Amino acid sequence: VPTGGDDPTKIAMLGLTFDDVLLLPAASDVLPANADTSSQLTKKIRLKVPLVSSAMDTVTEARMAIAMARAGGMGVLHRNLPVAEQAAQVETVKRSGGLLVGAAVGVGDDAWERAMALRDAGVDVLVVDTAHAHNRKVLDMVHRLKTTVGDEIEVVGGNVATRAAAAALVEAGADAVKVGVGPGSICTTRVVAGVGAPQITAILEAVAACAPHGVPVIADGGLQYSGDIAKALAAGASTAMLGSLLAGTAESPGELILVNGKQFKSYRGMGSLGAMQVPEGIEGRVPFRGPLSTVIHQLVGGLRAAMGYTGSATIEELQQAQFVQITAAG
Amino acid sequence: VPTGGDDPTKIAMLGLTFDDVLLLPAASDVLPANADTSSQLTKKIRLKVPLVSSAMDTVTEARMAIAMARAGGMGVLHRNLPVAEQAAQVETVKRSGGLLVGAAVGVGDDAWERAMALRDAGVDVLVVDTAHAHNRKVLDMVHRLKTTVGDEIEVVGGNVATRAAAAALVEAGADAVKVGVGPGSICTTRVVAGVGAPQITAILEAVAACAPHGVPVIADGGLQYSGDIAKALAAGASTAMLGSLLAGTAESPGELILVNGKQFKSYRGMGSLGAMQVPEGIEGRVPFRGPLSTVIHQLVGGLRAAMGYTGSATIEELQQAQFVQITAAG
Amino acid sequence: VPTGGDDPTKIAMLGLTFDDVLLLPAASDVLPANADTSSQLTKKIRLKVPLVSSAMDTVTEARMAIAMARAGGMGVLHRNLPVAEQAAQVETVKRSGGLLVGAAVGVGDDAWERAMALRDAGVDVLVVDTAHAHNRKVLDMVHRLKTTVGDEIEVVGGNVATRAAAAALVEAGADAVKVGVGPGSICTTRVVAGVGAPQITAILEAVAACAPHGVPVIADGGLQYSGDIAKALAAGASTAMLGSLLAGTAESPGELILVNGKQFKSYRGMGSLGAMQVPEGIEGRVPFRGPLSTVIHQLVGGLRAAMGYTGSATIEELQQAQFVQITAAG
Amino acid sequence: VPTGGDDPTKIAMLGLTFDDVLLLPAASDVLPANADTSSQLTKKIRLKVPLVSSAMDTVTEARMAIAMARAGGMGVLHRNLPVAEQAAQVETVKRSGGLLVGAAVGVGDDAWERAMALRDAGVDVLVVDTAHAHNRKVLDMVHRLKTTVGDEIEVVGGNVATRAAAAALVEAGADAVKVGVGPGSICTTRVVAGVGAPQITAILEAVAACAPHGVPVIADGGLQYSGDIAKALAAGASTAMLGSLLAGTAESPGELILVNGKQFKSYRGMGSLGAMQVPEGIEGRVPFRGPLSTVIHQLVGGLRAAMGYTGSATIEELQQAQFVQITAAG
């Protein structure tokens, strides 16, 4: 083995991130304005815009969830708050019209109670929301939810970063699989634990397990630009979950912060010290970006441009697009 | 597949940019001063210097086109202005002697009218000038122009970044194919859409489709140094189109700008907000560089040096030169 | 040969460092809090925490050795001081309870005398501590110590960076092999001598020689983050030796230094000018980090997280984990 | 072809520079202090230290040549001055004892006259000193010198960057071949012409042509650290030529320059504007480094360390050492 030792499997793959690839233009009769951006969030739920906001306390509460649903996407309400409060946020969203909404639950002692209260509040999607979904407790929770409330609620499981982990969630009954271990802008898992998987490779691997079973993949973490959304979908994901890109919007929780004449909002990992109240997230800030509606327009605009360049009339067509790998110089 | 999934074609190639390669010196009896720098702009039109200025409103109006033709190259007049005005600029150039001139047209509602007015004004080259030429509307426009005015006017189509797209333009009747999707200094297509093709690979691919049919390739975008011109031609292009490298000259449109004691000129993408009046270009500035004649001398000087080092007596010989690929460290 | 010449062995391998790889998550029923972090320092000695402090005069004297042993690791007392003083430090440590302690010796004229005095003082581990252990004098010293005091004292040899060098130390009777030529944060061997071996590859190679003989590998140098400890162990090392990461602690030798409002401690290579009194180390500073106990908690916390993510119940299981290689972009 | 087009030879090799490789430690019974650093400058001339100073007007005049010879190396007097003056510098050196000295000549109209005057002055080595030696005029000059004065004077030819060019110089009768096109610290050939060859690969290729004919290779350009000297020799070169590393010494031509409280000396390419009086060099400055004797001691010290680490008793043994290739992260 050229990189050391005698075991070719020790270094199992070469992991590519978003910056490692570009989409190749292809024959097209699709104008960006005419592309259909709709896509499956879960087996049953199709969104007008293939974007969902992160279940983070500096990204998604009721205001964000309402704005995301109105924009054609969806919000996933964070779970760093009492069960009654999270449930009350679900009701607030549902009372602003027939709007889709999701909510995160963990696998701890109060997770089941949380899930049932969210169910009672009329949640559409439950997201089993963990740092490591390749584990029996997480798989059991997904399965139990699907068997209990699965007729009326779609159940997402995550996060994973390998084909095997995605396959396990599929077998457990997941209605979507969320991919991302290590890539988040505020994530320090890579440096604290030394663990992660570059996101393009993670998506390609998860999709290899999920697409044959008709289970959509949600690409979660590491998306810095609108072009990354196109790359994630072309790699085979069906939707993208955004934290950093939405944390600077008016609708996110938290106050405006003025530093050196410029406007920012705080954005922090759910595994940061402040969120926990061994951290694997940081507490930072992102530029203030104005209203969500405007940010979503720019993000969807970039996606539409990519669909035009690749001749992709639909997201399902975009999932078949090809990449060129680039070097450091590029 | 080492990079993920089970499809070896998903990541179709490894794309190299100018910075990824150097020209290897070879046996030479060619002194730089004795090299012949002439090259085909189109099937019929040969230039003394293999350089043309970008069809951009901060690069080429009549003054630039006149200076470029006098220097042995050519200007392509931008199309971000009324048809009558663009046509009047063509006439201004033609009235400054027997000077070659080109002009850009799009494929929109007024493109045909624009083309005919430019034809009437005595334009030598029509450049069908689009972000994505791999499309029936663009191919139809090239073909229609060639069948209508092709006896008296050479028709260039662009831009493309793949062998297949170049092949389509050849079939449509293009007299030259312009290559570049993503590499422009002011381009944000790569980050907005996630789309592009590193330019050395794009040129090698386009040339593979174009050279067998005797159709010259114009390398457009990403050229930062005179050495990049040599690299583009060695990769098989016949001419290079320059934006950034010429935007700082006296002959480009726009005022001098003084910032922090240094002189600059504004340079902006035609897909920037200001040019459009979802942007895929930025508005920036480039150092002021003085007269075009002087810039062209330096650029051609570097090209001549490369021709000497590679033993290339002509541009056709330079097109057969070899590269070494370099690493990040280099 | 694509990189030059006609000898494929001239460039013998592609060397990976810590930053080149990440650990892949895997199926897990191991919670970080439940992982067993114990590991072999030497054939006979197992530590509660797989960490030992560097034998450097800005890292380990008696105070550090006592704190490291209490934290479940071990200190290796530096040898840049008179034999009597080093021996007295061993006694100071042993008089603070039944604490494990190691001490460095060289191979110079006074090395044997030093070793015997340390033996008399009750040292548990002798570390034959050299820049280049692939040499008969070093091998002889290891062998002589093992045959003379090997029943009561474990003998470590280092440093090496290749499979062959590790194999030689094993044959000589080493109870552990210490790996690291070039990677230290304060090391300039790479630039002064042009010599080194990227640490992940060095560990994989040394382990290939050592593991089949039941000899533990100590990964020494280049560890910048807690995640690097997990990577080193997953590459097959049994413990990690830390310099930079511990030099900023209260227990390290040396005063606090205030520069630009921030607190630091001096940290210097043992091959720096100041330590020698042709340098292959620098004299620098590292941020002040507070008490060792706290630093060790954070480092072990990150290790525990990695064990959870990789489904590793023990360090021996972690040694079987897999990596993904990452690119520059990642 | 993964990088574009259908010709596998278009991108002929992957070029490595010094930063791309490290020397692997190997079995050693060689202490750095006991290594023999002598090496062939040319077929007949062996130096005590394998270093020669660049033929540049900010590096080598008589003072530098005298100091280099006394240190066990040699200086090559630059040729940017009248023939009589260069000849007078040769005599100045020869009058400071039995000191070896070289002098550069070109291939222009006055080159032969220059060579004969240098011959008359008692020069030991004539260096045919060009940007591109792969050319009949250069080959003819080398051959003519060797046939005319070759019994009493050793003739070096350069510079080359390929196996074929080195082979041509060997056939022409060169007593040494000098390698380096593109790597010089003050060189802009890479950006102006787009031409060059990463130096480790260039050396491996030149050596493949030269070593089988017993012709030493001088590695010229790109050496930034003492470790680069070891790498160049391990790649198969017999000596290293230094510009930047010696330009900051007391013995180099030019005044001390004080900028922002720090001392520098000017260092400029011989193809810079100022040296010429289309530039392919820049005019810069390097830190003041004090006396040559001290710089040479540090450089030879690093070389000796490498010889120790690689078990190389002589430079001929060092030429057989192995490398590990490193990544960007390393």
Ligand SMILES: O=c1[nH]cnc2c1ncn2[C@@H]1O[C@H](COP(=O)(O)O)[C@@H](O)[C@H]1O
């Ligand atoms: O503290 C943390 N550590 C690691 N990942 C986190 C943390 N907090 C949130 N995440 C994940 O990072 C995603 C946001 O990534 P971003 O869009 O790149 O900022 C979220 O949707 C989570 O999957």
Ligand SMILES: O=c1[nH]cnc2c1ncn2[C@@H]1O[C@H](COP(=O)(O)O)[C@@H](O)[C@H]1O
């Ligand atoms: O707004 C834009 N977005 C993307 N490409 C552009 C834009 N404007 C001009 N271009 C292209 O970029 C080329 C100039 O590239 P440059 O010489 O690297 O500055 C032009 O000739 C166009 O092909």
Ligand SMILES: O=c1[nH]cnc2c1ncn2[C@@H]1O[C@H](COP(=O)(O)O)[C@@H](O)[C@H]1O
């Ligand atoms: O001066 C030096 N030159 C090269 N390596 C050194 C020197 N001093 C200590 N070391 C090694 O560097 C290790 C510390 O590396 P660090 O933890 O990255 O700072 C030590 O345990 C030694 O193996």
Ligand SMILES: O=c1[nH]cnc2c1ncn2[C@@H]1O[C@H](COP(=O)(O)O)[C@@H](O)[C@H]1O
């Ligand atoms: O102007 C120039 N352009 C390109 N190479 C130069 C020039 N001047 C000197 N050189 C070469 O660069 C070498 C010095 O490289 P350095 O030691 O890296 O600074 C010299 O020995 C020459 O071979």
Ligand SMILES: Brc1ccc(-c2c[nH]cn2)cc1
């Ligand atoms: Br601590 C910690 C908390 C959350 C995460 C995570 C990764 N992807 C989604 N959530 C990772 C670590």
Ligand SMILES: Brc1ccc(-c2c[nH]cn2)cc1
């Ligand atoms: Br067909 C087609 C038409 C227009 C585009 C485009 C993308 N960005 C700007 N223009 C792409 C494809």
Ligand SMILES: Brc1ccc(-c2c[nH]cn2)cc1
């Ligand atoms: Br919006 C937009 C406008 C122009 C371009 C382009 C790329 N190459 C030549 N022109 C791309 C995007």
Ligand SMILES: Brc1ccc(-c2c[nH]cn2)cc1
């Ligand atoms: Br033949 C030949 C002669 C001179 C050159 C050259 C290039 N740059 C500076 N000198 C190249 C080839």
Ligand SMILES: Brc1ccc(-c2c[nH]cn2)cc1
């Ligand atoms: Br000088 C000098 C002194 C110590 C080292 C070293 C490398 N790894 C452990 N110790 C290297 C060079």
Ligand SMILES: Brc1ccc(-c2c[nH]cn2)cc1
């Ligand atoms: Br099973 C299992 C449970 C929790 C983790 C973890 C690592 N970092 C944060 N949480 C990993 C694996």
Ligand SMILES: Brc1ccc(-c2c[nH]cn2)cc1
């Ligand atoms: Br202009 C010019 C002048 C000298 C060189 C050179 C390269 N290596 C040695 N000398 C290159 C270009």
Ligand SMILES: Brc1ccc(-c2c[nH]cn2)cc1
């Ligand atoms: Br054998 C042998 C002995 C000492 C060294 C060395 C190199 N740098 C510092 N010490 C190398 C090899």
